[PDB]
């Protein structure tokens, strides 16, 4: 109901954690397991590559259709670019229903 593709077997969840590396244990044994760990974190890169199957229009409409254009005007800030201090902003939501076809 939010829109999208309903999938019985969706893309599976990729779960990730840091392996716990404990600090120094005491000299004698104690079975109350571990509260002392080495405070750490990880970083890295992650790349996702989805292939999408397109469906071409077969339209026999005569007149021009409605497009998603950018307003060519004297603007202070370009749409869908970064700001004066590098904040990336998205000025409006873009749907996907622009082309037409008969019912």
């Amino acid at each position: 109901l939010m829109g999208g593709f309903g999938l019985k077997n969706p893309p599976p969840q990729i779960l990730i954690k840091n392996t716990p590396v404990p600090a120094n244990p005491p000299a004698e044994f104690s079975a109350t397991k571990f509260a002392s760990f080495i405070t750490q974190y990880s970083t890295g890169q992650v790349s996702v590559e989805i292939e999408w199957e397109l469906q071409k229009e077969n339209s026999k409409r005569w007149n021009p259709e409605v497009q998603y254009t950018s307003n060519y005007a004297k603007s202070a800030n370009v749409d869908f670019t970064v700001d004066n201090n590098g904040l990336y902003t998205e000025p409006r939501p873009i749907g996907t229903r622009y082309l037409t076809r008969p019912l």
């Binding site: 026999k60 007149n63 008969p102």
Partner: protein, 104 residues
């Protein structure tokens, strides 16, 4: 060809005039059929009927057009110009539709 002259209108016969026929087998015009209109074949085989006029409707902000109202020039479709010695044939295969329940 018909020619009016003081209500003594004679009908002559153009041997060289053509007739453009196409079947829109890609469904890219508004499908005005399936709307229970007149101008079908008559029920009785010994009747001569008159072909209806094609005319479609598109999107309307009341009685005005919207920018997404389509316009279709039908001479932008490949026709088959049929002079009096020519004929038009095509064939069509229905896709799998369920049987009509002709029972109570």
């Amino acid at each position: 060809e018909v020619t009016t002259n003081d209500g003594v209108t004679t009908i002559a016969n153009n041997l060289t005039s053509t007739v453009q026929v196409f079947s829109d087998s890609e469904y890219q015009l508004p499908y005005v059929l399936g709307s229970a209109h007149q101008g079908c074949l008559p029920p009785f085989p010994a009747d001569v009927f008159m072909i209806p006029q094609y005319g479609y409707l598109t999107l309307n902000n009341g009685s005005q057009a919207v920018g997404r109202s389509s316009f279709y020039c039908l001479e932008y479709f490949p026709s088959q110009m049929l002079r009096t010695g020519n004929n038009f044939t095509f064939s069509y295969t229905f896709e799998e539709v369920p049987f009509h329940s002709s029972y109570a």
